[PDB]
């Protein structure tokens, strides 16, 4: 409800990109709009380097980078669809990486929004049909569907 989700918070990211490239691409609209501090991306990669967020779900791997809420000015989400699977370390203590193709960058400063959005994500990435749609839909349609179900 108090979460800011705009059309330009959805991006398709091309082939040659690394973990740090994705975090910087997804953070870019949030910093431009003032939703986070200027070094928010640094704080995400640092946090990702020590506390991974790769979720090894089928059919498509998912990651959910974020940092401490003190670095968030206003609640927002940024979404990346990866043309190629980029590896993320497993959020649950594995060496086997997670081939991620969907990235949910969370920039939430409010704890009650954080748990609700994580709850929603857990339900959504167990919906194979939905995850399948995210790999074919365009940025506008991805924005429309996600904007609908996080309205509620």
């Amino acid at each position, epitope marked *: 409800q108090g979460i800011h989700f705009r059309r330009h918070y959805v991006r398709h990211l091309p082939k040659e990109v690394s973990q740090n490239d994705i975090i910087k691409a997804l953070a870019s609209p949030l910093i431009n709009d003032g939703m986070v501090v200027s070094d928010f991306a640094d704080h995400v990669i640092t946090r990702e380097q020590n506390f991974p967020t790769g*979720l090894p779900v089928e059919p498509v791997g998912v990651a959910i980078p974020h940092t401490d*809420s*003190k670095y*968030v000015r206003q609640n927002a989400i940024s979404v990346g669809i990866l043309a190629e699977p980029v590896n993320f370390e497993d*959020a649950g203590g594995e060496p086997d990486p997670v081939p991620v193709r969907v990235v949910f960058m969370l920039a*939430l*400063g*409010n*704890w*009650f929004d*954080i*748990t*609700n959005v*994580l*709850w929603w994500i*857990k339900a959504v990435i167990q919906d194979e049909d939905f995850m399948q749609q995210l790999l074919v839909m365009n940025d506008d349609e991805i924005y429309q569907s996600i904007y609908t179900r996080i309205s509620e």
Partner: antibody
Amino acid sequence: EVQLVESGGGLVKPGGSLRLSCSASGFDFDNAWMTWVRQPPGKGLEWVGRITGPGEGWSVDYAAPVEGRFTISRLNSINFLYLEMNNLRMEDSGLYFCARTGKYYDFWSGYPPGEEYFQDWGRGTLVTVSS
Amino acid sequence: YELTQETGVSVALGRTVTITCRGDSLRSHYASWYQKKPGQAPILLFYGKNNRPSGVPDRFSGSASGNRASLTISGAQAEDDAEYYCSSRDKSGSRLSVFGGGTKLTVLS
């Protein structure tokens, strides 16, 4: 290193009001959630209320017997937490603890809004309601 | 009480003992566990699925199933003789918190 020094407890009349303070040190207080807990005479710990941080607009929640009579506030510039107790009742008597409050949510098994837990406690300030 | 705990439990020194917290909100929420001695501030022992604060003896372990949360003390010591409180949400999805009634743990001397 963490200290939570409560004060303001003492004798107060039913129907009256009393303000409790707690002075916190040794942690990032600006971003910390803070909780009051009380121990009535001869009973166990009782959750009283909790104030959140800036990301939540400092919203407060209260225990049922206390809602509408107690007000929790904070002044972050001086690392103080406050409990303002109005319309005091005999059963408000007890030892009042201030507690630094953590937040927990497990992704795969969690349910919103997760759980709060009390990672550092003061020694409490004693309140006696009596006419 | 929304969370029910045994009133008192005895354990022989060096033996293992489990105390329990039970309630509907535990089907959706984890519990945290506290130790309190007469006249002293409570201390956090365990919370969440498997989190023990540094400085807490690793003989304290929490677990959970159904409407039940357990704290197990492997090899009880005389310094463990204390009161134990559980805490969790008062109802599933609630922003409020609540404590169980406390268990008096006696380490037989």
